[PDB]
Coordinates of C-alpha atoms (C1' of nucleotides) and ligand atoms in Angstrom, one line a residue:
Chain A
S1 CA 13.1 44.8 -54.6
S2 CA 15.4 46.9 -52.2
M3 CA 19.0 46.8 -51.1
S4 CA 19.5 47.4 -47.4
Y5 CA 22.4 49.7 -48.2
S6 CA 24.6 51.2 -51.0
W7 CA 28.1 52.6 -50.4
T8 CA 30.3 55.3 -52.0
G9 CA 33.6 53.6 -51.0
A10 CA 34.2 56.3 -48.4
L11 CA 35.5 54.6 -45.2
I12 CA 33.6 54.4 -41.9
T13 CA 35.9 56.5 -39.8
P14 CA 36.5 56.6 -36.0
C15 CA 35.0 59.1 -33.4
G16 CA 38.5 59.8 -32.1
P17 CA 41.0 57.4 -30.5
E18 CA 40.2 53.7 -30.2
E19 CA 41.6 52.8 -26.8
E20 CA 44.5 50.4 -26.5
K21 CA 44.8 47.8 -23.7
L22 CA 47.9 48.2 -21.6
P23 CA 50.9 45.9 -20.7
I24 CA 49.5 45.7 -17.1
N25 CA 45.8 45.4 -16.1
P26 CA 46.1 45.9 -12.3
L27 CA 42.4 45.6 -11.5
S28 CA 41.8 42.4 -13.4
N29 CA 45.1 40.5 -13.7
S30 CA 44.2 38.6 -10.5
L31 CA 40.8 37.6 -12.1
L32 CA 42.1 36.1 -15.3
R33 CA 45.3 35.6 -17.1
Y34 CA 44.4 35.4 -20.9
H35 CA 44.2 39.1 -21.6
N36 CA 45.2 38.5 -25.2
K37 CA 41.8 36.9 -25.8
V38 CA 40.0 40.0 -24.7
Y39 CA 39.4 42.6 -27.5
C40 CA 37.3 45.6 -28.5
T41 CA 35.5 45.9 -31.9
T42 CA 36.8 48.9 -33.9
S43 CA 36.1 51.0 -37.0
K44 CA 38.8 49.1 -38.9
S45 CA 36.3 46.2 -39.1
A46 CA 33.3 48.3 -40.1
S47 CA 33.9 47.4 -43.8
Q48 CA 33.6 43.6 -43.0
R49 CA 30.3 44.4 -41.2
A50 CA 29.0 46.5 -44.1
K51 CA 29.6 43.6 -46.6
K52 CA 27.8 41.1 -44.3
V53 CA 24.6 43.4 -44.0
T54 CA 24.3 44.8 -47.5
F55 CA 21.9 42.5 -49.4
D56 CA 18.6 42.6 -51.3
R57 CA 15.3 42.1 -49.5
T58 CA 12.2 40.7 -51.1
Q59 CA 9.4 40.3 -48.8
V60 CA 6.1 38.5 -49.3
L61 CA 3.3 38.9 -46.8
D62 CA 0.1 36.9 -46.5
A63 CA -3.2 36.5 -44.8
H64 CA -1.7 35.4 -41.5
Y65 CA 0.4 38.5 -41.3
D66 CA -2.6 40.7 -42.4
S67 CA -4.8 39.2 -39.8
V68 CA -2.1 39.9 -37.1
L69 CA -1.4 43.5 -38.1
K70 CA -5.2 44.1 -38.0
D71 CA -5.4 43.0 -34.4
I72 CA -2.4 44.9 -33.4
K73 CA -3.8 48.2 -34.8
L74 CA -7.0 47.6 -32.9
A75 CA -5.0 47.1 -29.7
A76 CA -3.0 50.2 -30.5
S77 CA -6.2 52.3 -30.8
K78 CA -6.8 51.9 -27.0
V79 CA -3.7 54.1 -26.4
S80 CA -3.8 57.8 -26.1
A81 CA -0.5 59.6 -26.1
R82 CA 0.7 63.1 -25.8
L83 CA 3.4 65.3 -27.2
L84 CA 6.2 66.1 -24.8
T85 CA 7.1 69.7 -24.4
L86 CA 10.3 70.7 -26.1
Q87 CA 11.6 71.2 -22.6
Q88 CA 10.6 67.7 -21.2
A89 CA 12.3 66.1 -24.2
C90 CA 15.5 68.2 -23.8
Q91 CA 15.7 66.9 -20.2
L92 CA 15.5 63.2 -21.2
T93 CA 18.7 63.6 -23.2
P94 CA 21.4 61.6 -21.4
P95 CA 24.2 63.6 -19.9
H96 CA 27.0 62.6 -22.4
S97 CA 24.9 62.3 -25.6
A98 CA 26.9 63.1 -28.8
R99 CA 27.0 66.9 -29.3
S100 CA 25.3 68.7 -32.2
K101 CA 27.1 69.9 -35.4
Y102 CA 25.6 73.3 -34.6
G103 CA 28.0 74.3 -31.7
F104 CA 26.3 72.9 -28.6
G105 CA 26.0 69.7 -26.6
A106 CA 24.0 67.8 -24.1
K107 CA 25.0 70.1 -21.1
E108 CA 23.3 73.0 -23.0
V109 CA 20.3 70.9 -23.9
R110 CA 19.7 69.6 -20.4
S111 CA 20.0 73.0 -18.8
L112 CA 17.7 74.6 -21.5
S113 CA 20.3 77.0 -22.8
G114 CA 18.7 79.5 -25.2
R115 CA 20.8 78.8 -28.2
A116 CA 19.9 75.1 -28.0
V117 CA 16.2 75.5 -27.3
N118 CA 16.2 77.9 -30.2
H119 CA 17.8 75.6 -32.7
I120 CA 15.5 72.8 -31.7
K121 CA 12.4 74.9 -32.3
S122 CA 13.6 75.6 -35.9
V123 CA 14.3 71.9 -36.4
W124 CA 10.7 71.1 -35.2
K125 CA 9.2 73.8 -37.5
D126 CA 11.1 72.3 -40.4
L127 CA 9.7 68.8 -39.5
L128 CA 6.2 70.2 -39.4
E129 CA 6.7 72.0 -42.8
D130 CA 8.8 69.6 -44.9
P131 CA 7.6 66.0 -44.9
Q132 CA 10.1 65.0 -47.6
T133 CA 13.8 66.0 -47.6
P134 CA 15.9 63.1 -46.4
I135 CA 17.6 64.0 -43.1
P136 CA 21.3 63.3 -43.0
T137 CA 22.8 60.8 -40.5
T138 CA 26.2 59.9 -39.1
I139 CA 27.4 56.2 -39.3
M140 CA 29.8 54.9 -36.7
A141 CA 31.2 51.5 -35.7
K142 CA 30.2 50.5 -32.2
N143 CA 33.0 49.6 -29.7
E144 CA 32.2 46.5 -27.8
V145 CA 34.3 44.0 -25.9
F146 CA 34.3 40.2 -26.5
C147 CA 36.5 37.1 -26.0
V148 CA 38.1 35.8 -29.1
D149 CA 36.2 32.6 -30.3
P150 CA 38.1 30.5 -32.9
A151 CA 35.1 28.2 -33.4
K152 CA 33.3 31.4 -34.8
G153 CA 36.3 32.8 -36.8
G154 CA 38.4 34.9 -34.4
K155 CA 37.1 38.5 -33.9
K156 CA 33.6 39.9 -34.6
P157 CA 33.3 43.0 -36.8
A158 CA 31.8 46.1 -35.1
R159 CA 28.1 46.7 -35.6
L160 CA 27.0 49.8 -37.4
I161 CA 25.2 52.7 -35.6
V162 CA 23.3 55.3 -37.6
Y163 CA 21.9 58.4 -35.9
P164 CA 20.7 62.0 -36.8
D165 CA 22.0 65.2 -35.2
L166 CA 21.3 65.9 -31.5
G167 CA 18.6 68.5 -32.5
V168 CA 16.6 65.9 -34.3
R169 CA 17.0 63.3 -31.5
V170 CA 15.2 65.7 -29.2
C171 CA 12.4 66.3 -31.7
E172 CA 12.0 62.5 -31.9
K173 CA 11.2 62.3 -28.2
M174 CA 8.7 65.2 -28.5
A175 CA 6.9 63.3 -31.1
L176 CA 7.3 59.7 -29.9
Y177 CA 8.6 59.3 -26.4
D178 CA 5.2 59.0 -24.7
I179 CA 4.3 56.3 -27.3
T180 CA 7.4 54.3 -26.6
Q181 CA 6.2 54.1 -22.9
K182 CA 2.8 52.8 -23.7
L183 CA 2.4 51.2 -27.2
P184 CA 4.5 48.1 -26.6
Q185 CA 2.7 47.1 -23.4
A186 CA -0.7 47.9 -25.0
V187 CA -0.1 45.8 -28.1
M188 CA 1.8 42.8 -26.5
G189 CA 0.7 42.7 -22.9
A190 CA 2.5 40.0 -21.0
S191 CA 4.6 39.1 -24.1
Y192 CA 6.5 42.4 -23.8
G193 CA 9.8 41.3 -22.5
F194 CA 11.4 44.5 -21.2
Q195 CA 8.9 44.7 -18.3
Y196 CA 10.4 41.9 -16.3
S197 CA 13.3 41.4 -13.9
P198 CA 15.2 38.1 -14.0
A199 CA 13.1 36.5 -11.4
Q200 CA 9.9 37.6 -13.1
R201 CA 11.2 36.5 -16.6
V202 CA 11.8 33.1 -14.9
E203 CA 8.4 33.0 -13.1
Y204 CA 6.6 33.9 -16.4
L205 CA 8.4 31.2 -18.5
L206 CA 7.7 28.6 -15.7
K207 CA 3.9 29.5 -15.6
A208 CA 3.9 29.3 -19.4
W209 CA 5.6 26.0 -19.3
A210 CA 3.4 24.4 -16.6
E211 CA 0.1 25.4 -18.3
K212 CA 0.7 23.2 -21.3
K213 CA -0.5 19.6 -21.2
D214 CA 2.7 18.6 -23.1
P215 CA 5.0 21.6 -23.7
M216 CA 7.5 22.4 -26.4
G217 CA 9.7 25.5 -26.5
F218 CA 12.0 27.3 -29.0
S219 CA 13.9 30.5 -29.4
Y220 CA 14.5 32.7 -32.5
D221 CA 16.7 35.5 -33.5
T222 CA 17.0 37.2 -36.8
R223 CA 20.3 37.5 -38.6
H224 CA 21.2 41.2 -38.8
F225 CA 17.7 42.3 -37.9
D226 CA 18.0 46.0 -38.5
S227 CA 19.2 45.4 -42.1
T228 CA 16.3 43.1 -42.8
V229 CA 13.7 45.7 -41.9
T230 CA 12.1 47.0 -45.1
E231 CA 10.8 50.5 -46.1
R232 CA 7.4 48.9 -45.9
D233 CA 8.0 47.5 -42.5
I234 CA 8.8 51.0 -41.3
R235 CA 5.7 52.6 -42.9
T236 CA 3.7 49.8 -41.2
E237 CA 5.4 50.9 -37.9
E238 CA 3.9 54.4 -38.6
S239 CA 0.5 53.0 -39.1
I240 CA 0.7 51.3 -35.8
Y241 CA 1.8 54.5 -34.1
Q242 CA -1.0 56.4 -36.0
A243 CA -3.6 54.0 -34.7
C244 CA -3.3 55.6 -31.2
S245 CA -5.2 58.9 -30.5
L246 CA -2.7 61.7 -30.9
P247 CA -2.8 65.5 -31.2
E248 CA -2.6 66.3 -34.9
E249 CA 0.8 68.0 -34.4
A250 CA 2.2 64.6 -33.4
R251 CA 0.7 62.8 -36.4
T252 CA 2.5 65.3 -38.7
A253 CA 5.9 65.0 -37.0
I254 CA 5.6 61.2 -36.8
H255 CA 4.8 61.1 -40.5
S256 CA 7.6 63.4 -41.4
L257 CA 10.1 61.5 -39.2
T258 CA 9.0 58.3 -40.8
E259 CA 9.5 59.6 -44.4
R260 CA 12.6 61.8 -43.8
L261 CA 14.5 59.6 -41.3
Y262 CA 13.1 56.2 -40.4
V263 CA 12.5 54.6 -43.9
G264 CA 15.9 55.6 -45.1
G265 CA 18.4 58.3 -46.0
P266 CA 22.0 59.3 -46.7
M267 CA 24.8 58.4 -44.3
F268 CA 27.9 60.5 -43.6
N269 CA 31.1 59.3 -41.8
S270 CA 32.6 61.4 -39.0
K271 CA 35.0 63.1 -41.4
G272 CA 31.9 64.6 -43.1
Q273 CA 32.1 62.6 -46.4
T274 CA 29.1 60.9 -48.1
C275 CA 29.3 57.3 -47.1
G276 CA 26.2 55.5 -48.4
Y277 CA 22.4 55.3 -48.5
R278 CA 20.1 53.3 -46.2
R279 CA 16.7 51.7 -46.8
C280 CA 16.5 49.8 -43.5
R281 CA 16.4 50.6 -39.8
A282 CA 18.8 53.1 -38.5
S283 CA 19.7 51.6 -35.1
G284 CA 20.2 54.9 -33.3
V285 CA 16.8 56.5 -33.7
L286 CA 14.4 56.7 -30.9
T287 CA 12.0 54.1 -32.3
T288 CA 14.8 51.4 -32.6
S289 CA 13.7 49.2 -29.6
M290 CA 9.9 49.8 -29.9
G291 CA 10.0 49.2 -33.6
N292 CA 12.3 46.1 -33.4
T293 CA 10.1 44.7 -30.7
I294 CA 6.8 45.4 -32.5
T295 CA 7.8 44.3 -35.9
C296 CA 9.3 41.2 -34.5
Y297 CA 6.1 40.5 -32.6
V298 CA 4.0 40.9 -35.8
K299 CA 6.1 38.7 -38.0
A300 CA 6.6 36.0 -35.3
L301 CA 2.9 35.8 -34.3
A302 CA 2.1 35.6 -38.0
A303 CA 4.7 32.8 -38.4
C304 CA 3.3 30.9 -35.5
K305 CA -0.1 31.0 -37.3
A306 CA 1.5 30.1 -40.7
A307 CA 3.1 27.0 -39.1
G308 CA 0.4 25.6 -36.8
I309 CA 1.9 26.5 -33.4
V310 CA -0.8 25.5 -31.0
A311 CA -1.4 27.7 -27.9
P312 CA 1.7 29.8 -28.2
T313 CA 2.9 31.9 -25.3
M314 CA 5.5 34.4 -26.3
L315 CA 8.1 36.6 -24.8
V316 CA 9.7 39.3 -27.1
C317 CA 12.7 41.5 -26.6
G318 CA 13.7 43.3 -29.8
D319 CA 14.5 40.6 -32.3
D320 CA 14.8 37.9 -29.6
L321 CA 12.0 35.6 -29.2
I322 CA 10.8 32.6 -27.1
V323 CA 7.6 30.7 -27.9
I324 CA 6.3 28.0 -25.6
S325 CA 3.4 26.0 -27.1
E326 CA 1.6 22.7 -27.1
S327 CA 3.7 20.0 -28.6
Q328 CA 2.1 18.1 -31.6
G329 CA 4.7 15.2 -31.2
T330 CA 8.3 15.6 -32.2
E331 CA 7.7 14.7 -35.9
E332 CA 5.1 17.5 -36.3
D333 CA 7.0 19.9 -34.0
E334 CA 10.1 19.7 -36.2
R335 CA 8.1 20.3 -39.4
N336 CA 6.3 23.2 -37.8
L337 CA 9.5 24.9 -36.9
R338 CA 10.7 24.6 -40.4
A339 CA 7.5 26.3 -41.6
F340 CA 7.9 29.0 -38.9
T341 CA 11.4 29.7 -40.3
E342 CA 10.2 29.6 -43.8
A343 CA 7.4 32.1 -43.1
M344 CA 9.8 34.4 -41.1
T345 CA 12.1 34.2 -44.0
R346 CA 9.3 35.3 -46.4
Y347 CA 8.5 38.1 -44.0
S348 CA 12.2 39.3 -44.4
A349 CA 13.3 38.1 -40.9
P350 CA 15.6 35.2 -41.6
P351 CA 17.3 33.3 -38.7
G352 CA 20.9 33.3 -37.7
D353 CA 20.7 29.7 -36.5
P354 CA 17.7 27.7 -37.5
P355 CA 15.4 27.2 -34.5
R356 CA 14.9 23.8 -32.9
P357 CA 12.1 22.3 -30.7
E358 CA 13.1 21.6 -27.1
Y359 CA 11.4 19.9 -24.2
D360 CA 13.5 21.0 -21.3
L361 CA 13.5 24.6 -20.3
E362 CA 17.3 24.7 -19.5
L363 CA 18.1 24.1 -23.2
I364 CA 16.3 27.3 -24.5
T365 CA 18.5 30.4 -24.8
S366 CA 17.3 33.9 -25.6
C367 CA 18.7 37.4 -24.9
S368 CA 21.9 35.5 -24.3
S369 CA 20.4 34.0 -21.2
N370 CA 18.5 30.8 -20.0
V371 CA 16.7 29.4 -17.1
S372 CA 18.5 26.9 -14.8
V373 CA 17.8 25.1 -11.6
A374 CA 19.5 24.5 -8.2
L375 CA 18.4 23.4 -4.7
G376 CA 17.6 25.9 -2.0
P377 CA 18.3 26.0 1.8
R378 CA 15.5 23.6 2.5
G379 CA 16.1 21.2 -0.5
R380 CA 13.3 22.5 -2.7
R381 CA 14.0 23.2 -6.5
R382 CA 15.0 26.9 -7.2
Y383 CA 14.7 28.3 -10.8
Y384 CA 16.8 31.3 -11.8
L385 CA 18.2 33.1 -14.8
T386 CA 21.9 32.7 -15.9
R387 CA 24.1 32.8 -19.0
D388 CA 27.4 31.9 -20.4
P389 CA 29.9 34.0 -18.3
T390 CA 32.5 34.3 -21.1
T391 CA 31.6 37.8 -22.3
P392 CA 31.0 39.1 -18.8
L393 CA 34.4 37.8 -17.8
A394 CA 35.9 39.5 -20.9
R395 CA 34.3 42.8 -20.0
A396 CA 35.4 42.4 -16.4
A397 CA 38.9 42.6 -17.9
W398 CA 38.5 45.6 -20.0
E399 CA 40.9 48.2 -18.4
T400 CA 42.3 51.3 -20.2
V401 CA 43.3 54.9 -19.4
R402 CA 39.6 55.8 -19.8
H403 CA 37.6 52.7 -18.8
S404 CA 37.4 51.0 -15.5
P405 CA 35.8 47.6 -15.4
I406 CA 34.4 47.8 -11.8
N407 CA 31.0 49.0 -13.0
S408 CA 30.8 46.0 -15.3
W409 CA 31.4 43.7 -12.3
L410 CA 28.7 45.4 -10.3
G411 CA 26.1 45.2 -13.1
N412 CA 26.6 41.5 -13.4
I413 CA 26.6 40.8 -9.6
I414 CA 23.2 42.4 -9.4
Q415 CA 21.6 40.9 -12.6
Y416 CA 23.0 37.4 -11.9
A417 CA 23.5 37.2 -8.2
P418 CA 22.0 33.8 -7.8
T419 CA 24.5 32.3 -10.4
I420 CA 27.4 30.1 -9.3
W421 CA 29.8 32.3 -11.4
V422 CA 28.8 35.6 -9.8
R423 CA 28.8 34.1 -6.3
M424 CA 32.1 32.4 -6.4
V425 CA 34.0 34.5 -8.9
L426 CA 32.8 38.0 -9.5
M427 CA 31.6 38.7 -5.9
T428 CA 34.9 37.3 -4.5
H429 CA 36.9 39.5 -6.9
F430 CA 34.8 42.6 -6.5
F431 CA 34.9 42.6 -2.7
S432 CA 38.6 41.7 -2.6
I433 CA 39.5 44.6 -4.9
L434 CA 37.4 47.3 -3.0
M435 CA 38.6 46.2 0.4
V436 CA 42.3 46.5 -0.6
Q437 CA 41.6 49.8 -2.3
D438 CA 39.7 50.7 0.9
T439 CA 36.7 51.9 -1.3
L440 CA 33.9 49.6 0.0
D441 CA 31.7 52.4 1.1
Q442 CA 32.1 54.5 -2.1
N443 CA 29.2 54.6 -4.5
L444 CA 29.3 53.1 -8.0
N445 CA 27.1 53.4 -11.0
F446 CA 25.0 50.5 -12.3
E447 CA 24.1 50.6 -16.0
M448 CA 20.8 49.0 -17.3
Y449 CA 18.6 49.8 -20.4
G450 CA 20.3 53.2 -20.8
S451 CA 19.8 54.1 -17.2
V452 CA 22.4 54.4 -14.5
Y453 CA 21.8 53.9 -10.8
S454 CA 24.1 54.9 -8.0
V455 CA 24.7 51.9 -5.7
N456 CA 26.6 51.3 -2.6
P457 CA 28.6 48.0 -2.3
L458 CA 27.6 47.6 1.3
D459 CA 23.9 47.5 0.3
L460 CA 24.3 44.5 -2.0
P461 CA 22.8 42.1 0.4
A462 CA 19.6 44.1 0.7
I463 CA 19.3 44.8 -3.0
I464 CA 19.9 41.2 -3.8
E465 CA 17.2 40.0 -1.3
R466 CA 14.8 42.5 -2.7
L467 CA 15.6 41.6 -6.3
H468 CA 16.1 37.8 -6.2
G469 CA 15.0 36.5 -2.9
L470 CA 16.8 35.3 0.3
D471 CA 17.5 32.0 -1.4
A472 CA 20.0 33.7 -3.7
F473 CA 22.3 33.4 -0.7
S474 CA 21.8 29.7 -0.1
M475 CA 21.6 27.8 -3.4
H476 CA 23.6 24.7 -3.9
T477 CA 23.8 21.7 -6.2
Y478 CA 23.9 23.7 -9.5
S479 CA 23.2 21.8 -12.7
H480 CA 25.5 19.8 -14.8
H481 CA 25.2 22.2 -17.8
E482 CA 25.9 25.1 -15.5
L483 CA 29.0 23.6 -13.7
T484 CA 30.4 22.5 -17.1
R485 CA 29.9 25.8 -18.8
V486 CA 31.4 27.8 -15.9
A487 CA 34.4 25.5 -15.5
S488 CA 35.0 25.7 -19.2
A489 CA 34.7 29.5 -19.4
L490 CA 37.2 30.0 -16.5
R491 CA 39.6 27.7 -18.3
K492 CA 39.2 29.5 -21.6
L493 CA 40.1 32.9 -20.1
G494 CA 42.9 31.6 -17.9
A495 CA 41.1 32.2 -14.6
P496 CA 41.5 30.2 -11.5
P497 CA 39.1 27.3 -11.1
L498 CA 36.2 27.3 -8.7
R499 CA 38.2 25.5 -5.9
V500 CA 40.6 28.4 -5.8
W501 CA 37.9 31.0 -5.7
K502 CA 36.5 29.1 -2.7
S503 CA 39.8 29.7 -0.9
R504 CA 39.9 33.3 -1.8
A505 CA 36.3 33.7 -0.8
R506 CA 37.0 32.3 2.8
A507 CA 39.7 35.0 3.2
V508 CA 37.4 37.8 1.8
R509 CA 34.6 36.6 4.1
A510 CA 36.8 36.8 7.2
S511 CA 38.1 40.3 6.4
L512 CA 34.5 41.5 5.9
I513 CA 33.4 39.9 9.1
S514 CA 36.2 41.5 11.1
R515 CA 35.3 45.0 9.9
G516 CA 31.9 44.6 11.5
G517 CA 29.1 46.9 10.5
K518 CA 27.5 46.6 7.1
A519 CA 30.7 45.0 5.7
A520 CA 30.2 42.1 8.1
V521 CA 26.7 41.5 6.8
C522 CA 28.1 41.3 3.3
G523 CA 30.5 38.7 4.6
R524 CA 27.8 36.6 6.2
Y525 CA 25.1 36.9 3.5
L526 CA 27.2 37.0 0.3
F527 CA 29.7 34.3 1.3
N528 CA 27.9 31.8 3.4
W529 CA 28.4 29.4 0.5
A530 CA 32.1 29.5 1.3
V531 CA 32.1 27.9 4.8
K532 CA 31.3 24.5 6.4
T533 CA 29.5 26.0 9.5
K534 CA 26.7 27.5 7.3
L535 CA 24.9 30.3 9.3
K536 CA 21.1 30.8 9.5
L537 CA 20.2 33.7 7.3
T538 CA 17.2 35.8 8.1
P539 CA 15.3 38.5 6.1
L540 CA 17.0 41.8 6.1
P541 CA 15.0 44.8 7.4
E542 CA 16.7 47.2 5.1
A543 CA 15.4 45.0 2.3
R544 CA 11.6 45.6 3.1
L545 CA 12.2 49.3 2.9
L546 CA 13.3 49.2 -0.8
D547 CA 11.7 49.9 -4.3
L548 CA 13.6 48.5 -7.3
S549 CA 10.7 48.4 -9.9
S550 CA 12.2 51.1 -12.2
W551 CA 15.4 49.1 -12.6
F552 CA 13.8 46.7 -15.1
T553 CA 11.2 49.3 -16.4
Chain B
rG1 C1' 23.3 56.2 -31.1
rC2 C1' 18.3 54.8 -28.9
rC3 C1' 15.5 52.4 -25.4
Ligands
CDP1 N1 23.9 47.8 -29.4 C1 22.8 47.4 -30.1 C2 22.5 46.0 -30.3 C3 21.3 45.7 -31.0 N2 20.5 46.7 -31.5 C4 19.3 46.5 -32.3 O1 18.8 45.2 -32.1 C5 18.9 44.4 -33.4 C6 19.1 42.9 -33.1 O2 20.4 42.8 -32.5 P1 21.1 41.3 -32.3 O3 21.7 41.5 -31.0 O4 20.2 40.1 -32.6 O5 22.2 41.4 -33.5 P2 21.8 41.6 -35.1 O6 20.4 41.0 -35.2 O7 22.0 43.1 -35.4 O8 22.9 40.9 -35.9 C7 20.0 45.1 -34.1 O9 19.9 44.8 -35.5 C8 19.7 46.5 -33.8 O10 18.7 47.1 -34.6 C9 20.9 48.1 -31.3 O11 20.2 49.0 -31.7 N3 22.0 48.4 -30.6
CL2 CL1 14.4 25.4 -0.3
MN3 MN1 19.6 39.2 -34.3
MN4 MN1 1.8 59.2 -42.4
MN5 MN1 19.1 39.4 -31.0

RNA sequence: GCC
């Protein structure tokens, strides 16, 4: 049937300058040495990406799908959702959002300037009146940082981002923001992934694992998911939205947004030229996460049913999927997973790597992360979330005139505090840098799901206790997989090995202790792993007085 | 670019 894209041959041009690394990286050249391996994806590679995502979709649904969609619509119908005022929507626009072509930006939008509010009213009127004219979008290459991998062909090409003008983005929120806050949870319940912190993700996967008489687990990811999403998938997303009770004005805007924007349209580069035409998901519109997550849930749950997965418990995050089910023996389990993949492929959600049954929770990876296990202060097993540190290490070394990597360090320290690589490497480096800068008590921003939170380094111990438990400060005897992977990643980026970080950590610890105050608590709590005379660590008062629930919505 |  449909191509995902067509192209005019016009290039995908840059936003402005694409930052160069420098001959000296003063914040990160004591963390690792192989700076050559660390690179940013640029618009030069946008052509290579285009080729790899332009292809013809043919989708074939069936009774399992139909049955699943039916049940999801019913679940949707228990949701009521409101329009947002034009003003509420303006004020959910992030502070640095790309400016409009009509001479105003996000500052004006957030402060409700008259010009801006005016334009947005006209845009909304035109949405309510015209349910048809395709709405033009800009296409840009995303800039992300990775570590070169020769096993996977050198350097990844940039992914493509497609979005409408700022004025339309605000209208999207008016129509659909309230739904994005409610529909996912209503349709998927406990399966909805973005509701959990690391420790909760872990606790959920463990409960799920323990409930089975004889468990089996697998993970799934769709190759180039946005480009596999069909016009029909998108219209089916509308039906799911429409199954909620909504003021009629929302219904009309939602429908018009679907037909003029979501199902497809023309794409312009940043130089203004016509670039191509799209008949798949624009990753850039408001409904990108909600849609990806819901359409993935629909297909996946259908696939489980097509393939005989018994007693599936799921966890879904965009196109990333884990299912833990009752094993039917390894012979049947392997056949079933092939059926699953076959069904998903029919549903136009083909895999990057074919999935595989597993029978040990450590070997299942999803959202680039996995559960692992260590021993706690009293010798009991302690389960926690970790990941390959390669990319976090690479981003820890992205330093330019306009980008400091310190926020990156902080974000990882908080998400992955119980990991051996955060504790020994990133924490040691982070504290060492800030002490020498004398900026320990200065606040930093922590980025997560589009939100930023001001955090003070001297509060890490409390935040960590709240978020991960007091055991995060006392875990030992990490697993073989985990020690192997960390050693290997440090070697690959030319970073000192763990032994050395242990020395550096003893020094950082002592400096912190000698400053007394909150700094000394950082020294005792965060670096107790680093000394022979291991102190007794007690619950922190400041911790009890703390609410971090919004951090992981 | 969006959650
Ligand atoms: N920076 C990102 C990354 C992913 N995504 C969305 O999530 C989808 C799945 O992402 P992924 O990480 O599995 O990579 P692909 O499946 O795109 O190759 C993408 O196709 C996008 O629609 C996004 O909107 N922005
Ligand atoms: Cl313990
Ligand atoms: Mn994918
Ligand atoms: Mn409609
Ligand atoms: Mn994915």
